[PDB]
Each structure stands twice: as C-alpha cells, then as structure tokens.
Structure 1
Amino acid sequence: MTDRYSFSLTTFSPSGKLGQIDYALTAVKQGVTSLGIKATNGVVIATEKKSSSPLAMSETLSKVSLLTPDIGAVYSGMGPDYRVLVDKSRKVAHTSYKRIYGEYPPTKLLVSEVAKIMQEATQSGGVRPFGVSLLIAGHDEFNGFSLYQVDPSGSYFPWKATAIGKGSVAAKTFLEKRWNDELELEDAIHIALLTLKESVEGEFNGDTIELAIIGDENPDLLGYTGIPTDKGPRFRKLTSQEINDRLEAL
C-alpha cells in the first residue's frame, strides 16, 4: 500500500525522503505569513494574526513570545503546538545553561536546544512532532545579531530575510525585492510593513498585526536601575497603539 505517514518514528521512508514533513510543511504552509529581516544594527520580525470571530480579543493572541530579553521569536502554525514546545524549551535553557552558567542564553546555544526537542519528537515513536515553524531572532556578545529559521525536520539555517507560512515562497522573493543586505534596521521596518500588507488587505492595523523589533537596550523595560554592568533588554514589543504610528509614517 501507500506510506503510513512516518516521521521515521518506527519506519524509514522508502521514497528516500520523509513524505509527512512536506505534509508537516503543509501545516507550516497552513500558518500565517511571518517574515524577518536581519540587518547590521538590528533585526525586525513581522507577522499577522488571525481575526477569526469579530468579537475575539486580539490582545490575547501573542505570536511573538519572550524567551530571553535579547532574543525574540515568532512562529506560524497551530496554536497549541507552539505552547508545548516553548514550555519545554524554556526549561531546557534554564537547566542546561541558566542553572550552570547563570547568565542569559546566547543565540547559538538557545536555538540549537530548541531544535533538539524536534529531534527527539522525530526519534521517539508514538509522539508526533509539532508542525509549527519558528523564526528566532536574537543579539548576543559573541555572534551578534542572528536570524534563524527552525524547520520541523530538525534543521536550522541563518537567513538575512526569510518568510514562513502560506507566503513562505511568495514573501521570500518580496523581502529580497524591496530589501538588500546593505540596508539598516530603520528602513527594514518600512519594508516589513509593505510586504506583510500584501498578505491580507482587510485590516492592516495593530489589532490583527503583531510587530516586534530587536535593537538597542531599553532602560524602561529593565525594571531596575543602579547597576551599569547588567544590560537592558534588547527586545521591545511594539504596542498596537504604537504600531499605528508606524503605519501613518509608512
């Protein structure tokens, strides 16, 4: 008969490549269009939120979470698939690093540990890997700014500008269309708004659009003063009221 839809849990794919990954990438393609732009002085990520019912509160859905103050993340796919992954991903960064080195996890170690959970889901039978794709953007002292595309197959690669979701193929050219590596962060946000606007024309406001940036530390989000050594959070989530300010200036 046809294939049994194996992750290589108990069975290797006879076709030479796993067929359900493309069906898991179909669940990735099922997700909203989410993009990111890696520049020299900062990294910006943009994504759209599903409206669903008109009475659903838009502030409840957060498609950009906080792992470490210097590293942001954005995802496209099923809702509960991202929560179970990150709830376990946080405990990995705490025990394997923060309970040992007692600092904030860098960009190289944190992204690698997130992909290891997907590797265990593919290896351990009976547990289906989650079909969400995560775009992790962060800034550390060692490697600096970084933008990585985490695939459900367990592979990650750096990208200057990349997109996931239904517009993964379409917006990838659109990001390369208006943006180049020589551009800075300020001109990158305007490009991210123009590219994400082409995804849906219904509502471009901050209610259904969640925009976040990575950049210079903000002392207002540090929560304390008096210590010059400890750096402030490099990730600042843009309020929906502030998102409309960038729309009028777009």
Structure 2
Amino acid sequence: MTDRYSFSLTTFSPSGKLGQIDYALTAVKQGVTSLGIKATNGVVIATEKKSSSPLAMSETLSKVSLLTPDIGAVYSGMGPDYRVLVDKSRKVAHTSYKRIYGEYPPTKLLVSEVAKIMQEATQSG
C-alpha cells in the first residue's frame, strides 16, 4: 500500500491551462444555483434544496452551514466536497485562530484558510 501518488495530478497544459481546475469549475457550473447579497446591516445567502427523492428528508441535508457564530457558508457543485470543507473550515477557525487569540476569526481570514486548503488540493500529490 502506502499512498504512492506523491506527484501532482493537476498540471499545466501547453496552453497554460490547469485542466483539473477548469474541469472542477465545470462541475460547479452543473451545480444548483446559490447566491449571496450584502446589505448595509446584514448579508443573505440562499440556495435551492434540490431534493434527490421525495422520500428523502431534505431538512437533514444542510446546504447552508454555520462555520462560526458570525460566519455562514453556501455552495454550488459537489455536495460531499462541500461537507468535508465545512468540517475543515470549522476546525481551522479554532486551531489556527480561536485557540490562539481567544476569539473567532474575521470573515476574510477564515475565507483565506479555506482558500488555502482548496489551493493545496490543486498542487499536492
């Protein structure tokens, strides 16, 4: 065994394109529409609960997730990828910030941490 894939699976093509990122964006394009609007005294994020079956209880599937008491997230694309990112985002808000400064991270810095995780899946082996 051992993970023997220690090389990048995303690489530059002759045209300068990073194929796997483009294809990931194509998967996002197929995803259900979600949106966000910023007001003077608040922000709203919204999406459609596209229920896969009427027998499914769509309340048990949360597309909009609390990351911190003052930060929320919504997505478009692959649900399972989102779910694990929410787990990582929640944890990193504690490990790389709250356990250091005794307060929750500002939005931009939590976004920065999530972004870093997504960047690494674009370069790591």
TM-score range relative to shorter protein = 0.7 to 0.9
**Partner residue of 2:120?**
120
Instruction: Show CA shifts across 1:145-196 (max 9, x none).
Output: xxxxxxxxxxxxxxxxxxxxxxxxxxxxxxxxxxxxxxxxxxxxxxxxxxxx
Instruction: Flag the 1:40–1:4 CA change in 2: closer, same or farther, 3 A.
Output: farther
Task: Tell me, yes or no, if the aligned pair for 2:10 and 2:19 is still in contact at 8 Å.
Answer: no
Query: In proportion to residue count, which structure has more helix?
Result: 2
Deviation at 1:77, TM superposition (A): 1.5
Instruction: Flag the 1:16–1:44 CA change in 2: closer, same or farther, 3 A.
Output: same
**Partner residue of 1:98?**
98
Instruction: Flag the 1:36–1:85 CA change in 2: closer, same or farther, 3 A.
Output: same
The 3-state SS of whatever aligns with 2:65 is strand
- Taking structure 1 as the reference length, what is the TM-score of the superposition? 0.44
Distance 2:47 2:3 in 1: 35
Deviation at 1:24, TM superposition (A): 0.9
Distance 1:3 1:25 in 2: 26
Runs (5+) with no aligned partner, structure 2: none
Task: Tell me, yes or no, if the aligned pair for 1:45 and 1:74 is still in contact at 8 Å.
Answer: yes
| Max Rg structure | 1
Instruction: Flag the 1:95–1:13 CA change in 2: closer, same or farther, 3 A.
Output: same
1:223-234 map, 5 Å: none
Runs (5+) with no aligned partner, structure 1: 123-250
Distance 1:83 1:66 in 2: 12
Deviation at 1:45, TM superposition (A): 1.2
Task: Tell me, yes or no, if the aligned pair for 1:31 and 1:76 is still in contact at 8 Å.
Answer: yes
Percent of matched pairs sharing the same residue: 100
Task: Tell me, yes or no, if the aligned pair for 1:66 and 1:73 is still in contact at 8 Å.
Answer: yes
Distance 1:6 1:32 in 2: 33
- Deviates further, 59-68 or 84-93: 84-93
Instruction: Flag the 1:5–1:54 CA change in 2: closer, same or farther, 3 A.
Output: farther
Distance 1:119 1:80 in 2: 18
Query: In proportion to residue count, which structure has more strand?
Result: 1
Task: Tell me, yes or no, if the aligned pair for 1:8 and 1:18 is still in contact at 8 Å.
Answer: no
Task: Tell me, yes or no, if the aligned pair for 1:64 and 1:74 is still in contact at 8 Å.
Answer: yes
Deviation at 1:34, TM superposition (A): 0.4
Task: Tell me, yes or no, if the aligned pair for 1:7 and 1:21 is still in contact at 8 Å.
Answer: no
Task: Tell me, yes or no, if the aligned pair for 2:45 and 2:74 is still in contact at 8 Å.
Answer: yes
Deviation at 1:104, TM superposition (A): 1.3
Instruction: Show CA shifts across 1:93-143 (max 9, x none).
Output: 111101100111111211100000011111xxxxxxxxxxxxxxxxxxxxx
Instruction: Flag the 1:3–1:91 CA change in 2: closer, same or farther, 3 A.
Output: closer
- Runs of 4 or more consecutive aligned structure 1 residues displaced over 4 Å after TM superposition: 1-8
**Partner residue of 1:11?**
11
Task: Tell me, yes or no, if the aligned pair for 1:89 and 1:114 is still in contact at 8 Å.
Answer: yes
Task: Tell me, yes or no, if the aligned pair for 2:68 and 2:93 is still in contact at 8 Å.
Answer: no
How many corresponding residue pairs?
Answer: 122
Distance 1:52 1:7 in 2: 36
Deviation at 1:66, TM superposition (A): 0.6
Distance 1:64 1:27 in 2: 19
